[PDB]
């Protein structure tokens, strides 16, 4: 069974550098072509680059958006694949997957020398965020009726945020929306839950945890 585990990456301001790493196990790393694929948040897949075996020249080939800025390298003794990112831009944010590429020779005589090329095994992905924002905890604001209750977790960075209701005792009918990046560079989301007779009978509190700033807020909605 093939196992790819990725590390590195994280948060960095634009114009800075950042190295991703992909550790291979379960196959012959040295005899395999490798590469990377990324997916900006809300966008689709986009090939980043590949690298050949050492005997093939260890040639690094890159997509247009990242050529001249990203470089791939491999370590056959450590079975490691690296993606060196420098002069980063906000548009480089997203989830980078390292891939185990392989090919199949084309048999049509006129195309002898060409191959099908594909990513046969993909890693779990590593998140890259290119932003100038500093670490900040959220401001939890209540969402009161006039039923629908909710909490507004506003102005935090980076992701993620955890939200529960009544310390996890209340889960039926909950909707915690994905975060949205605001024009300020900070993230925002809301958690909501849907009887009108429970007002007064039951108090409602949302438990907002933000580990990046080590913040815990229990906010009552009434």
């Amino acid at each position: 069974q093939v196992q790819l585990v990725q590390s590195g990456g994280g948060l960095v301001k634009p114009g800075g550098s950042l190295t991703l790493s992909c550790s291979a196990s379960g196959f012959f790393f040295d005899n395999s072509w490798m590469g990377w694929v990324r997916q900006a948040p809300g966008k689709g897949l986009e090939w980043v680059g590949r690298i050949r075996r050492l005997k093939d020249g260890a040639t690094g080939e890159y997509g247009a958006a990242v050529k001249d800025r990203f470089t791939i390298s491999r370590d056959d003794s450590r079975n490691m694949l690296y993606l060196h990112m420098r002069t980063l831009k906000t548009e480089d944010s997203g989830t980078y997957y390292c891939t185990m590429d392989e090919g199949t020779p084309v048999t049509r005589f006129l195309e002898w020398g060409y191959f099908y090329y594909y990513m046969a095994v993909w890693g779990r992905g590593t998140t890259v965020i290119v932003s100038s924002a500093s670490t900040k905890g959220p401001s939890v604001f209540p969402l009161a009726p006039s039923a629908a209750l909710g909490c507004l977790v506003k102005d935090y960075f980076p992701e993620p945020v955890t939200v529960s209701w009544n310390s996890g005792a209340l889960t039926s009918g909950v909707h915690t929306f994905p975060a949205v990046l605001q024009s300020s560079g900070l993230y925002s989301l809301s958690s909501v839950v849907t009887p009108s007779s429970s007002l007064g009978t039951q108090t409602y509190i949302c438990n907002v945890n933000h580990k990046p700033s080590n913040t815990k807020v229990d906010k009552r909605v009434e």
């Binding site: 392989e102 090919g103 020398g113």
Partner: peptide
């Protein structure tokens, strides 16, 4: 590296045969 055989070694061999 003499013991490394994969798809890419085929295509380079078929290419050489075709172009020569």
């Amino acid at each position: 590296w003499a013991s490394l055989w994969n798809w890419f070694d085929i295509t380079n061999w078929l290419w050489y045969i075709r172009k020569k």
